[PDB]
Amino acid sequence: MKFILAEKFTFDPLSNTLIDKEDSEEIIRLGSNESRILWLLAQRPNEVISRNDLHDFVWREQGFEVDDSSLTQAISTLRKMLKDSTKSPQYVKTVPKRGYQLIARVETVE
DNA sequence: GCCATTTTCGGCCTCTGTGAAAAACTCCCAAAGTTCCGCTATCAGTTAGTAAAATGATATAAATCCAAC
Numbered sequence: 001m002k003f004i005l006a007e008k009f010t011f012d013p014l015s016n017t018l019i020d021k022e023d024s025e026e027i028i029r030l031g032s033n034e035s036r037i038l039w040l041l042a043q044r045p046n047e048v049i050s051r052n053d054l055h056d057f058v059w060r061e062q063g064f065e066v067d068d069s070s071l072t073q074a075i076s077t078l079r080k081m082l083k084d085s086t087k088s089p090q091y092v093k094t095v096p097k098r099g100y101q102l103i104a105r106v107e108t109v110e
Numbered sequence: 111g112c113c114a115t116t117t118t119c120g121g122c123c124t125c126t127g128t129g130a131a132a133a134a135c136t137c138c139c140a141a142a143g144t145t146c147c148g149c150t151a152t153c154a155g156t157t158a159g160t161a162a163a164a165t166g167a168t169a170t171a172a173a174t175c176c177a178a179c
Binding site for chain 2: 094096097
Protein backbone atom coordinates (compact mmCIF):
# COMPACT_ATOMS: atom_id res chain seq x y z
CA MET A 1 0.00 0.00 0.00
CA LYS A 2 1.29 3.43 -1.00
CA PHE A 3 1.29 6.41 1.36
CA ILE A 4 1.06 10.14 0.67
CA LEU A 5 2.72 12.60 3.06
CA ALA A 6 1.37 16.15 3.51
CA GLU A 7 -0.41 15.96 0.13
CA LYS A 8 3.05 16.52 -1.40
CA PHE A 9 5.21 13.38 -1.26
CA THR A 10 4.35 9.78 -2.08
CA PHE A 11 6.23 6.75 -0.81
CA ASP A 12 5.79 3.03 -0.65
CA PRO A 13 7.03 0.70 2.11
CA LEU A 14 7.69 -2.15 -0.31
CA SER A 15 9.91 -0.56 -2.97
CA ASN A 16 11.40 2.41 -1.05
CA THR A 17 10.83 5.20 -3.55
CA LEU A 18 9.91 8.84 -3.01
CA ILE A 19 8.07 11.05 -5.50
CA ASP A 20 7.56 14.80 -5.11
CA LYS A 21 4.50 16.16 -6.90
CA GLU A 22 6.22 19.51 -7.41
CA ASP A 23 8.96 17.73 -9.40
CA SER A 24 7.42 14.50 -10.65
CA GLU A 25 10.32 13.87 -13.05
CA GLU A 26 12.91 13.42 -10.27
CA ILE A 27 12.54 10.25 -8.21
CA ILE A 28 14.03 10.58 -4.72
CA ARG A 29 16.15 7.65 -3.54
CA LEU A 30 16.18 6.82 0.17
CA GLY A 31 18.13 4.35 2.25
CA SER A 32 16.45 1.29 3.68
CA ASN A 33 16.84 2.33 7.32
CA GLU A 34 15.34 5.81 6.99
CA SER A 35 12.58 4.49 4.73
CA ARG A 36 11.60 1.85 7.28
CA ILE A 37 11.72 4.44 10.08
CA LEU A 38 9.38 6.73 8.14
CA TRP A 39 7.05 3.83 7.32
CA LEU A 40 6.91 2.93 11.01
CA LEU A 41 6.12 6.57 11.77
CA ALA A 42 3.32 6.46 9.19
CA GLN A 43 1.86 3.28 10.72
CA ARG A 44 1.13 5.34 13.85
CA PRO A 45 -0.33 8.60 12.52
CA ASN A 46 0.99 11.62 14.40
CA GLU A 47 1.42 10.08 17.83
CA VAL A 48 4.66 9.87 19.78
CA ILE A 49 6.78 6.73 19.42
CA SER A 50 9.66 5.89 21.73
CA ARG A 51 13.21 6.07 20.43
CA ASN A 52 13.91 2.73 22.11
CA ASP A 53 10.87 0.95 20.66
CA LEU A 54 11.23 2.31 17.13
CA HIS A 55 14.97 1.58 17.18
CA ASP A 56 14.49 -2.00 18.31
CA PHE A 57 11.69 -2.60 15.82
CA VAL A 58 13.76 -1.19 12.96
CA TRP A 59 17.11 -2.86 13.61
CA ARG A 60 16.51 -6.07 15.58
CA GLU A 61 14.35 -7.44 12.76
CA GLN A 62 17.39 -6.65 10.60
CA GLY A 63 19.19 -9.22 12.77
CA PHE A 64 21.99 -6.93 13.94
CA GLU A 65 22.56 -4.46 16.75
CA VAL A 66 23.84 -0.89 16.41
CA ASP A 67 24.34 2.06 18.74
CA ASP A 68 21.76 4.80 19.20
CA SER A 69 23.74 7.39 17.24
CA SER A 70 22.69 5.49 14.11
CA LEU A 71 19.06 6.42 14.78
CA THR A 72 19.90 10.10 15.09
CA GLN A 73 21.96 10.01 11.90
CA ALA A 74 19.17 8.22 10.04
CA ILE A 75 16.64 10.84 11.14
CA SER A 76 19.09 13.59 10.16
CA THR A 77 19.39 12.14 6.65
CA LEU A 78 15.61 11.72 6.48
CA ARG A 79 15.04 15.38 7.33
CA LYS A 80 17.81 16.49 4.97
CA MET A 81 16.69 14.54 1.90
CA LEU A 82 13.01 15.40 2.44
CA LYS A 83 14.09 19.08 2.58
CA ASP A 84 12.10 19.34 5.80
CA SER A 85 12.81 22.32 8.04
CA THR A 86 16.01 22.22 10.07
CA LYS A 87 14.26 22.65 13.42
CA SER A 88 10.71 23.78 12.70
CA PRO A 89 7.88 21.22 13.04
CA GLN A 90 6.85 20.91 9.39
CA TYR A 91 7.00 17.18 8.55
CA VAL A 92 9.15 15.33 11.12
CA LYS A 93 10.36 16.50 14.53
CA THR A 94 11.98 15.15 17.68
CA VAL A 95 10.23 15.42 21.05
CA PRO A 96 12.81 15.16 23.87
CA LYS A 97 12.65 12.44 26.52
CA ARG A 98 9.61 10.99 24.75
CA GLY A 99 10.61 10.14 21.18
CA TYR A 100 9.90 11.15 17.59
CA GLN A 101 6.95 12.82 15.88
CA LEU A 102 5.60 13.21 12.36
CA ILE A 103 3.47 16.10 11.14
CA ALA A 104 2.81 15.20 7.49
CA ARG A 105 -0.67 13.86 6.75
CA VAL A 106 -1.23 10.18 5.90
CA GLU A 107 -3.12 9.37 2.69
CA THR A 108 -3.30 5.67 1.83
CA VAL A 109 -3.45 5.28 -1.95
CA GLU A 110 -4.58 1.65 -1.74
C1' DG B 111 104.15 33.47 97.16
C1' DC B 112 100.03 32.54 99.92
C1' DC B 113 94.94 32.43 101.62
C1' DA B 114 90.03 31.93 100.42
C1' DT B 115 86.09 31.90 98.00
C1' DT B 116 83.96 30.28 93.28
C1' DT B 117 83.68 26.86 89.75
C1' DT B 118 83.48 22.43 87.94
C1' DC B 119 82.78 17.41 87.74
C1' DG B 120 80.85 12.94 89.46
C1' DG B 121 79.44 4.99 84.30
C1' DC B 122 76.20 2.53 80.69
C1' DC B 123 71.43 0.20 79.23
C1' DT B 124 65.83 -0.49 80.46
C1' DC B 125 60.94 1.71 82.44
C1' DT B 126 58.59 6.31 83.08
C1' DG B 127 53.83 9.83 82.37
C1' DT B 128 51.44 16.20 84.84
C1' DG B 129 47.12 17.87 86.79
C1' DA B 130 46.83 19.77 93.14
C1' DA B 131 47.10 28.39 96.60
C1' DA B 132 46.76 33.17 95.38
C1' DA B 133 40.30 37.69 96.21
C1' DA B 134 37.00 43.45 91.94
C1' DC B 135 33.60 45.62 89.30
C1' DT B 136 31.40 49.07 85.86
C1' DC B 137 30.45 51.79 81.67
C1' DC B 138 31.24 52.93 76.77
C1' DC B 139 32.66 52.03 72.14
C1' DA B 140 34.69 49.71 68.17
C1' DA B 141 35.78 45.63 65.54
C1' DA B 142 35.51 40.95 64.69
C1' DG B 143 32.39 37.02 64.22
C1' DT B 144 27.93 34.75 63.04
C1' DT B 145 24.22 34.20 59.82
C1' DC B 146 21.27 34.98 55.88
C1' DC B 147 20.42 35.98 51.13
C1' DG B 148 21.42 37.02 46.52
C1' DC B 149 24.42 36.78 42.37
C1' DT B 150 27.79 34.30 39.82
C1' DA B 151 30.97 30.76 38.36
C1' DT B 152 31.76 25.94 37.66
C1' DC B 153 30.76 21.33 36.75
C1' DA B 154 28.14 16.71 36.31
C1' DG B 155 24.26 14.53 33.63
C1' DT B 156 21.61 14.05 29.56
C1' DT B 157 19.73 14.64 25.19
C1' DA B 158 19.71 15.64 20.35
C1' DG B 159 22.05 17.32 15.85
C1' DT B 160 25.33 17.88 11.91
C1' DA B 161 29.38 17.11 9.18
C1' DA B 162 32.93 13.91 8.41
C1' DA B 163 35.68 9.78 8.76
C1' DA B 164 35.80 4.79 8.79
C1' DT B 165 34.50 0.69 7.48
C1' DG B 166 32.04 -2.78 5.01
C1' DA B 167 29.23 -4.21 1.12
C1' DT B 168 28.45 -4.42 -3.46
C1' DA B 169 29.63 -3.54 -8.31
C1' DT B 170 32.43 -3.70 -12.29
C1' DA B 171 36.21 -5.12 -14.76
C1' DA B 172 39.58 -8.64 -16.18
C1' DA B 173 42.79 -13.72 -15.69
C1' DT B 174 42.87 -17.73 -16.55
C1' DC B 175 41.53 -22.19 -16.45
C1' DC B 176 39.13 -26.23 -17.03
C1' DA B 177 35.97 -29.34 -19.53
C1' DA B 178 34.03 -30.70 -23.54
C1' DC B 179 34.17 -31.25 -28.46
